[PDB]
Design a protein around this motif. Structure first.
Motif, PDB file in Angstrom:
ATOM      1  N   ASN A   1       0.834  -1.184   0.000  1.00  0.00           N
ATOM      2  CA  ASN A   1       0.000   0.000   0.000  1.00  0.00           C
ATOM      3  C   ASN A   1       0.877   1.245   0.000  1.00  0.00           C
ATOM      4  OD1 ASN A   1      -3.257  -0.538   1.484  1.00  0.00           O
ATOM      5  ND2 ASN A   1      -2.685   0.625  -0.345  1.00  0.00           N
TER       6      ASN A   1
ATOM      7  N   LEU B   1       0.331   5.093   1.132  1.00  0.00           N
ATOM      8  CA  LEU B   1       0.225   5.369   2.558  1.00  0.00           C
ATOM      9  C   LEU B   1       1.486   6.087   3.032  1.00  0.00           C
ATOM     10  CD1 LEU B   1      -1.935   3.258   2.000  1.00  0.00           C
ATOM     11  CD2 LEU B   1      -1.450   2.226   4.223  1.00  0.00           C
TER      12      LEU B   1
ATOM     13  N   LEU C   1       1.558  -1.133   7.144  1.00  0.00           N
ATOM     14  CA  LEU C   1       1.158  -0.478   5.904  1.00  0.00           C
ATOM     15  C   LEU C   1       1.384  -1.436   4.738  1.00  0.00           C
ATOM     16  CD1 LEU C   1       2.790   3.024   6.535  1.00  0.00           C
ATOM     17  CD2 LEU C   1       0.492   2.239   7.125  1.00  0.00           C
TER      18      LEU C   1
END
Length: 97
Positions: free
Chosen positions: A52, A55, A75
């Motif tokens: 991700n 993030l 994350l």
């Protein structure tokens, strides 16, 4: 109220980027955008599906030089955390002076 969007992107940093990402060989001064740059380009070079990346957009080098294996796992967990960090910590094995 959205003006001068390109201003939120810090200028290309060190020449210590060699021929790599235009980032210092010390992932401390990788700017907000420059962290996301490699980070994006990292999924790109290393084949990282479980990442991700959007993030870390607010994380720059000072915050990623902090990050431990645990911090990435909240994350981007499992093997992906280790890939990224194991790259980062080696990058700063030869930091910008």
């Amino acid at each position: 109220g959205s003006h001068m969007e390109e201003k939120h992107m810090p200028p290309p940093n060190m020449t210590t980027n060699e021929r790599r990402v235009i980032v210092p060989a010390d992932p401390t001064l990788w700017s907000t955008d420059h962290v996301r740059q490699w980070l994006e380009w990292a999924v790109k070079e290393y084949g990282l599906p479980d990442v991700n990346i959007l993030l870390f957009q607010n994380i720059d080098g000072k915050e990623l030089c902090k990050m431990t294996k645990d911090d990435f796992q909240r994350l981007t967990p499992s093997y992906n955390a280790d890939i990224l960090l194991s790259h980062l910590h080696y990058l700063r094995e030869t930091p910008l002076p």
